[PDB]
Every structure is written in structure tokens, then in C-alpha cells.
Amino acid sequence: ATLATKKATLVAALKDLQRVTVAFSGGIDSTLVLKMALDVLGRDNVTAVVANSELFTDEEFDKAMSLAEELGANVQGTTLDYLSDDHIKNNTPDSWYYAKKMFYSRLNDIAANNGSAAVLDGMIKGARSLLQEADFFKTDVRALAQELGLTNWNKVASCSVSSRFPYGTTLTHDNIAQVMAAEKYLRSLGFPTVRVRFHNDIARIELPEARIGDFLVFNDRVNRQLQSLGFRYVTLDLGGFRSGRMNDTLTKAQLATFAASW
């Protein structure tokens, strides 16, 4: 019902699971659970685990680590070898599941050796997703994180760099470095939400459509900058990032049909 009741449903499961390990990504979803666990259970009874890996930037790792210390949490860096998994290494469509399976297996073992009763993630509307078990929607997380005074969290969602390569394409340290350096370079010009999709020698840039207007001034520099990172053709996706999201009634449903044809 009200936010208070959903918050009370949250408190009740925390006090029932005496100790917990928090799977902490830095986003607002995990910021909420990590904060709530601390103030219901205490700094001595909650441990923060921030995964480190080759599929995420050193910046998202560094940022989540500082956010967890500054929430008063005792934080733990943990290091996963996703690219030693042939599904992930070869980016089959089922990569995402084996990568999560490697993930939660690590927290299973880590929670085992710190006395925890469950492993909590931050998923909303055998780990526990109390936000989902308390009927928290997106609107409820923002409100609760507002009333708790939390102000710092990943404003732009982090995503596994697998999303930038086609399926079947094998990921290499050269690949990822190529894609990560190109997205880092774009972000430095003022495009925080950006994807650089990798297509062998074509680099294919997705911007928020609202921003494409402002991007025209950086064409030549982006083109020469990304070429020197090894792309022959630097191109701009005319659909933008999350195409169809802002299309009118008729062209979002058509754009979905094309999205489903692949």
C-alpha cells in the first residue's frame, strides 16, 4: 500500500535474517538495500561485496567502492573471471545467465564464511530480492531513497560491455579496451548515456535522440578519435539509444517489429 508499509515489510525481513551480504552494484537499487540493511542490522552485521571484472570499467568499480564506505558499510572487493567462461567469452545469447551464475556463486561462498543468512540483491518489480518481496516499483525506490537522504548513486546505469558486441562474437582484451576507450572518450565530451556498438570495423554510436543535435559539433573529432582506436568506419545510429522509447504511437510499434526480426 503506502510507502511506509512497503518500508516496514522491508525492515521485517532484515531483522529476521540476522546477517546479510549485500551484492552492491552502485545503482540506486542496491544503494537502497545496502542502506536499509545497515540501519536495521548495523555495520558489524552487513558486508558489502562489489564485483570487479573485465566486463565493467575501473570507474564503476571505484565509484561503488567509495559509495559503500561512505554509507558506513564495511566493503569487500571481489574479483570475477568472466572471460574464462566459454559462453561469456564467446557471447552466446545465454551469456548473461552464466555470468550471473558465476556472480552469485561467489557471493554464496563469501556469505558462507562471514556468517550471513542470505545474499541480497537489488531487484525490484538462491539470493533474496527483498525490494521485489516488498512490492517496490521504480517510483517507490526513488521515493524511499529520497526520504532516507541518499543522494549519490549511479545516475546512468552501468551495463556489461557484452551488450556492445554481437552474439557469437568472441570478446578479447583488445575488443573491450577498444569499446571502453571509445565510450570513455564520448562521455568526456558530455554524453554520459552512450553506447558504442562494435561491428568489426564499423563502430556504431547510439546517443539519446535528444542529444544528437548537440553532437554535430564533435563529428570530425569522434571520427578521427575512434578510427585511431582501430575502427575503419565511425558511424551514428539514426535510431539512437533505446530507439522507439520516444517514438509516437505508430513508429514505436513498428520499431518493435524490426527489433523482434533479429
Q: Which 165-224 positions form the footprint of a copy of itself (CB under 8 A)?
A: 185, 188-191, 199, 201-202, 204-205, 208-224
- Span interacting with a copy of itself, options 83-91, 109-117, 144-152, 167-175, rule CB under 8 A: 144-152
* Residue ranges in 2-41 that form contacts with a copy of itself under rule CB under 8 A: 2-4
Of 12, 117, 157, 159, which is the active-site residue? Answer: 159
Catalytic residue status for 233 = no
C-beta of 209: minimal distance to Fe ion in Å?
Answer: 11
Name the site residues for Fe ion (rule: CB under 5 A).
214
Nearest C-alpha neighbor of 232 from the set 195, 260, 204, 193? 204
At 253, is the secondary structure helix, strand, or coil? helix
At which residue does the C-alpha cell 560491455 appear?
161
**Taking a C-beta distance cutoff of 8 angstroms, is the pair 207, 215 a contact?**
yes
Q: Which is it for strands 20-23 and 195-199: parallel, antiparallel or unpaired?
A: unpaired
**Distance separating alpha carbons of residues 217 and 209, to the nearest angstrom:** 15
**Distance separating alpha carbons of residues 189 and 191, to the nearest angstrom:** 6
Q: C-alpha cell of 185?
A: 572518450
Applying CB under 8 A, among 32, 67, 99, 130 the residue interacting with a copy of itself is 67
- The residue among 149 and 213 lying less far from Fe ion, judged by its C-beta, is 213
Residue 142 binding: pick among a copy of itself, Fe ion, none (C-beta 5-8 Å cut-off by kind): a copy of itself
| DSSP of 161-229 | GGGGS-TTPPP-HHHHHHHHHHHHHHHHTT-SS-EEEEETTEEEEE--HHHHHHHGGGHHHHHHHHHHT
Q: C-alpha cell of 160?
A: 556489461
- The residue among 4 and 159 lying less far from a copy of itself, judged by its C-beta, is 4
C-beta of 158: minimal distance to Fe ion in Å?
Answer: 24
C-beta of 207: minimal distance to Fe ion in Å?
Answer: 11
Residue type, 238: L
- The residue among 18 and 152 lying less far from a copy of itself, judged by its C-beta, is 152
* Residue ranges in 84-123 that form contacts with a copy of itself under rule CB under 8 A: none
163 is an interface residue for a copy of itself by CB under 8 A: no
78 is an interface residue for a copy of itself by CB under 8 A: no
**Distance separating alpha carbons of residues 177 and 164, to the nearest angstrom:** 12
Residue 168 binding: pick among Fe ion, a copy of itself, none (C-beta 5-8 Å cut-off by kind): none
Beta-bridge mates of residue 51 = 78
What element of type H or E holds 146?
A: helix 138-147
- The residue among 125 and 211 lying less far from Fe ion, judged by its C-beta, is 211
235 is an interface residue for a copy of itself by CB under 8 A: yes
**Taking a C-beta distance cutoff of 8 angstroms, is the pair 46, 19 a contact?**
yes
C-beta of 72: minimal distance to a copy of itself in Å?
Answer: 5
At which residue does the C-alpha cell 570487479 appear?
52
Task: Compute the residue count for the chain.
Answer: 262
- The residue among 113 and 188 lying less far from a copy of itself, judged by its C-beta, is 188
Residue 101 binding: pick among a copy of itself, Fe ion, none (C-beta 5-8 Å cut-off by kind): none
Catalytic machinery residues:
159
